[PDB]
Design an enzyme around this catalytic site. Structure first.
Site, PDB file in Angstrom:
ATOM      1  N   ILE A  21       4.123  15.474  -7.071  1.00  0.00           N
ATOM      2  CA  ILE A  21       5.169  14.888  -6.239  1.00  0.00           C
ATOM      3  C   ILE A  21       5.337  13.395  -6.511  1.00  0.00           C
ATOM      4  O   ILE A  21       6.458  12.913  -6.707  1.00  0.00           O
ATOM      5  CB  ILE A  21       4.912  15.144  -4.735  1.00  0.00           C
ATOM      6  CG1 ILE A  21       5.041  16.629  -4.402  1.00  0.00           C
ATOM      7  CG2 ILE A  21       5.882  14.328  -3.864  1.00  0.00           C
ATOM      8  CD1 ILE A  21       4.858  16.920  -2.931  1.00  0.00           C
ATOM      9  N   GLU A  23       3.011   9.236  -6.169  1.00  0.00           N
ATOM     10  CA  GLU A  23       1.807   8.412  -6.123  1.00  0.00           C
ATOM     11  C   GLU A  23       1.603   7.833  -4.728  1.00  0.00           C
ATOM     12  O   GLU A  23       2.546   7.316  -4.120  1.00  0.00           O
ATOM     13  CB  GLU A  23       1.880   7.275  -7.150  1.00  0.00           C
ATOM     14  CG  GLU A  23       1.975   7.749  -8.587  1.00  0.00           C
ATOM     15  CD  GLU A  23       0.663   8.303  -9.102  1.00  0.00           C
ATOM     16  OE1 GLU A  23      -0.397   7.909  -8.563  1.00  0.00           O
ATOM     17  OE2 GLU A  23       0.693   9.145 -10.029  1.00  0.00           O
ATOM     18  N   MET A  28      -2.731  10.433  -6.380  1.00  0.00           N
ATOM     19  CA  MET A  28      -1.422  11.064  -6.421  1.00  0.00           C
ATOM     20  C   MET A  28      -1.240  12.072  -5.294  1.00  0.00           C
ATOM     21  O   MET A  28      -2.194  12.512  -4.642  1.00  0.00           O
ATOM     22  CB  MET A  28      -1.196  11.744  -7.774  1.00  0.00           C
ATOM     23  CG  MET A  28      -2.199  12.806  -8.120  1.00  0.00           C
ATOM     24  SD  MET A  28      -1.607  13.945  -9.394  1.00  0.00           S
ATOM     25  CE  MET A  28      -1.666  12.877 -10.824  1.00  0.00           C
ATOM     26  N   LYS A  44      -2.778  14.695  -0.781  1.00  0.00           N
ATOM     27  CA  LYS A  44      -2.908  13.348  -1.330  1.00  0.00           C
ATOM     28  C   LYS A  44      -4.359  13.162  -1.769  1.00  0.00           C
ATOM     29  O   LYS A  44      -5.277  13.315  -0.954  1.00  0.00           O
ATOM     30  CB  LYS A  44      -2.505  12.291  -0.295  1.00  0.00           C
ATOM     31  CG  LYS A  44      -2.725  10.842  -0.745  1.00  0.00           C
ATOM     32  CD  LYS A  44      -2.164   9.821   0.263  1.00  0.00           C
ATOM     33  CE  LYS A  44      -2.924   9.815   1.587  1.00  0.00           C
ATOM     34  NZ  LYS A  44      -2.542   8.597   2.381  1.00  0.00           N
ATOM     35  N   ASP A 139       3.459  -1.666   7.467  1.00  0.00           N
ATOM     36  CA  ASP A 139       4.049  -1.418   6.152  1.00  0.00           C
ATOM     37  C   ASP A 139       5.191  -0.420   6.234  1.00  0.00           C
ATOM     38  O   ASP A 139       5.316   0.485   5.393  1.00  0.00           O
ATOM     39  CB  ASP A 139       3.004  -0.958   5.134  1.00  0.00           C
ATOM     40  CG  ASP A 139       3.384  -1.326   3.693  1.00  0.00           C
ATOM     41  OD1 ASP A 139       4.320  -2.136   3.462  1.00  0.00           O
ATOM     42  OD2 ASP A 139       2.792  -0.729   2.766  1.00  0.00           O
TER      43      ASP A 139
HETATM   44  C1  LIG Z   1       2.753   9.447   2.598  1.00  0.00           C
HETATM   45  C2  LIG Z   1       1.753  10.471   2.074  1.00  0.00           C
HETATM   46  C3  LIG Z   1       2.151  11.922   2.247  1.00  0.00           C
HETATM   47  O1  LIG Z   1       3.394  12.151   1.536  1.00  0.00           O
HETATM   48  C4  LIG Z   1       3.881  13.387   1.632  1.00  0.00           C
HETATM   49  O2  LIG Z   1       3.375  14.222   2.334  1.00  0.00           O
HETATM   50  C5  LIG Z   1       5.142  13.616   0.864  1.00  0.00           C
HETATM   51  C6  LIG Z   1       5.788  14.860   1.026  1.00  0.00           C
HETATM   52  O3  LIG Z   1       5.264  15.778   1.866  1.00  0.00           O
HETATM   53  C7  LIG Z   1       6.970  15.154   0.370  1.00  0.00           C
HETATM   54  C8  LIG Z   1       7.520  14.205  -0.476  1.00  0.00           C
HETATM   55  O4  LIG Z   1       8.682  14.471  -1.143  1.00  0.00           O
HETATM   56  C9  LIG Z   1       6.902  12.979  -0.666  1.00  0.00           C
HETATM   57  C10 LIG Z   1       5.727  12.684   0.002  1.00  0.00           C
HETATM   58  O5  LIG Z   1       5.106  11.491  -0.180  1.00  0.00           O
HETATM   59  C11 LIG Z   1       5.513  10.701  -1.299  1.00  0.00           C
HETATM   60  C12 LIG Z   1       4.626   9.478  -1.290  1.00  0.00           C
HETATM   61  O6  LIG Z   1       4.695   8.831  -2.564  1.00  0.00           O
HETATM   62  C13 LIG Z   1       5.080   8.527  -0.175  1.00  0.00           C
HETATM   63  O7  LIG Z   1       6.358   7.991  -0.537  1.00  0.00           O
HETATM   64  C14 LIG Z   1       4.114   7.381   0.112  1.00  0.00           C
HETATM   65  O8  LIG Z   1       3.931   6.686  -1.103  1.00  0.00           O
HETATM   66  C15 LIG Z   1       2.764   7.829   0.664  1.00  0.00           C
HETATM   67  O9  LIG Z   1       1.853   8.029  -0.112  1.00  0.00           O
HETATM   68  C16 LIG Z   1       2.571   8.010   2.145  1.00  0.00           C
END
Ligand SMILES: *[C@@H]1CCOC(=O)c2c(O)cc(O)cc2OC[C@@H](O)[C@H](O)[C@H](O)C(=O)C1
Length: 341
Positions: A21, A23, A28, A44, A139
């Protein structure tokens, strides 16, 4: 052990059929199938144990999210890690699978006024809960706002969060770096450590402006440049707002600038709803003490279709108030024990 783009994901056997998905902080994010609940989830991967600041960010997030329970905050469904501290090298946090994040959405999609209104309502509803726990997110930005397929919104990433501490918020000029630059309130550069709730309202106002135009409203190219962009639109602070800033270096910097006029919001955003622009102005108020608070924002006419204080819950158990990484690792191990066999 499945690998995704040269990265081991030791999440079996419960979670299978992984897909990249994006980072996160120390690793990741992937989607996976949950063989117990027969739904796909997000996972994550975090690898923080070499560095004390990484351990801090990881512990903050886990401690907060395990206490929080709210529809507009993404929760922790499971935590995967080795059974012993010795063998623990990574942590996997399992959460609901969402469809996109607002950062990715805004790169290609124009938002209807109905979507902007609903998204803003949900951001503030989640923020009301966070602030009621005496917690600051610190943030907020589009990439930390997740959307599912029916446009339900959840706030992500509490690794930068702190307990509010307004009595200790004052600091010197040009010292603080709280938030991602584009979403950072003017006082961060002037005299604030980012320990009051008004820091988050500023970020929300930046997000609202970005939803109205699909471009960041204050895209500073580096640290002090961020204040240039803010003042370029808000214009020069009033005498009253300057008298609010007792720190001489910060006040004298502002006094040294030439007079700048305010750019009207309806000139920046000619197709925007006038009620949206009135609320935007109140969130993007220079003086943090005059800036609208989350409960006032929820009660603003722009959100009248959604506003319902009895359906806008608060936290049951607010948070009341130098550790080497070895002790932080032990703390992370202890905090994640509930998800073991
Ligand atoms: C959020 C961390 C969890 O992120 C997610 O659960 C997530 C889901 O379920 C779907 C999609 O499309 C994206 C996503 O997180 C993307 C991350 O990169 C997010 O933008 C952020 O960086 C993060 O890690 C906090």
């Amino acid at each position: 052990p499945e690998m995704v783009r040269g990265q081991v994901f030791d999440v079996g056997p419960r979670y299978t059929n992984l897909s990249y998905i994006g980072e996160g902080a120390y690793g990741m994010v992937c989607s996976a199938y949950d063989n117990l609940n027969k739904v796909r989830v997000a996972i994550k991967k975090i690898s923080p144990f070499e560095h004390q600041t990484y351990c801090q960010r990881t512990l903050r997030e886990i401690k907060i999210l395990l206490r929080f329970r709210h529809e507009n905050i993404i929760g922790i469904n499971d935590i995967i890690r080795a059974p012993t501290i010795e063998q623990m090298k990574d942590v996997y946090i399992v959460q609901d699978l969402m469809e996109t994040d607002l950062y990715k959405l805004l790169k290609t999609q124009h938002l209807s006024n109905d979507h902007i209104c609903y998204f803003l309502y949900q951001i503030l509803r989640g923020l009301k809960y966070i602030h009621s726990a005496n917690v600051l997110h610190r943030d907020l930005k589009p990439s930390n706002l997740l959307l599912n397929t029916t446009c339900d919104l959840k706030i992500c990433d509490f690794g930068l969060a702190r307990v509010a501490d307004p009595d200790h918020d004052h600091t010197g000029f040009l010292t603080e770096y709280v938030a991602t630059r584009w979403y950072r309130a003017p006082e961060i550069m002037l005299n604030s450590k980012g320990y009051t709730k008004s820091i988050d309202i500023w970020s929300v106002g930046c997000i609202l402006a970005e939803m109205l135009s699909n471009r960041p409203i204050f895209p500073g190219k580096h640290y002090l440049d961020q204040l240039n962009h803010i003042l370029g639109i808000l214009g020069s602070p009033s005498q009253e707002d300057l008298n609010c800033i007792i720190n001489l270096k910060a006040r004298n910097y502002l006094l040294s600038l030439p007079h700048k006029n305010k750019v009207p919001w309806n000139r920046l955003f000619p197709n925007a709803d006038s009620k949206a622009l009135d609320l935007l102005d109140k969130m993007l108020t220079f003086n943090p003490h005059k800036r609208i608070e989350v409960e006032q924002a929820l009660a603003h006419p722009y959100l009248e279709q959604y506003y319902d204080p009895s359906d806008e819950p608060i936290a049951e158990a607010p948070f009341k108030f130098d550790l080497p990484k070895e002790k932080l690792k032990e703390l992370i191990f202890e905090e994640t024990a509930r998800f073991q066999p």
